[PDB]
Amino acid sequence: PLIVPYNLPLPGGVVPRMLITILGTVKPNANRIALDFQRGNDVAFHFNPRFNENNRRVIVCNTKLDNNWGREERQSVFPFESGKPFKIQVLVEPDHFKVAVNDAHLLQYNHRVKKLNEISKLGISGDIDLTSASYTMI
Ligand SMILES: CO[C@@H]1[C@@H](n2cc(-c3ccc(Cl)c(F)c3F)nn2)[C@@H](O)[C@@H](CO)O[C@@H]1Cc1cn(C2(CF)COC2)nn1
Numbered sequence: 316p317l318i319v320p321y322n323l324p325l326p327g328g329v330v331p332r333m334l335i336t337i338l339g340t341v342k343p344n345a346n347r348i349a350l351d352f353q354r355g356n357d358v359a360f361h362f363n364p365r366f367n368e369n370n371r372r373v374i375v376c377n378t379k380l381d382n383n384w385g386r387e388e389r390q391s392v393f394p395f396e397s398g399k400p401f402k403i404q405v406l407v408e409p410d411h412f413k414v415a416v417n418d419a420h421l422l423q424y425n426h427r428v429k430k431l432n433e434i435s436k437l438g439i440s441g442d443i444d445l446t447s448a449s450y451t452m453i
Pocket residue numbers: 347348349361363375376377384385386387440441442
């Protein structure tokens with residue numbers, strides 16, 4: 316186990332068939348979790364479970380370019396529970412990131428940042444106990 320915030324290097328960026336697995340436990344009274352796939356200061360893919368946005372649970376996904384947040388893609392299907400162990404898997408495909416949580420498909424996010432081989436860091440932050448963060452090629 317690791318203390319957040321944690322930054323997982325992605326040397327030479329990401330490539331299709333790369334499967335990034337984040338294991339942890341959601342804190343009791345969790346408010347937010349964030350994964351930030353970064354290309355330098357740009358956030359190619361921000362994955363942001365929010366546990367109480369206007370008393371609703373929502374997944375917010377977005378890209379940050381030149382320090383500006385773009386168009387949010389939102390999803391009400393919310394597989395996380397306060398206090399429970401989770402597995403987030405981000406599978407890099409040619410045209411999108413595919414996200415599955417606890418072995419159930421959650422969402423796809425089309426590549427806005429095109430230079431996959433420059434998405435060289437993954438930041439992990441928010442209301443989790445981080446167990447591990449790793450990747451393999453499928
Ligand atoms: C509150 O800041 C949010 C941003 N955010 C979260 C964290 C964050 C830090 C620390 C921790 Cl531990 C975490 F879990 C975290 F999520 N940092 N920045 C990010 O979630 C963004 C996504 O779109 O939304 C917000 C910012 C935002 C959104 N917008 C619009 C365009 F998108 C929506 O109408 C205009 N303009 N600004």
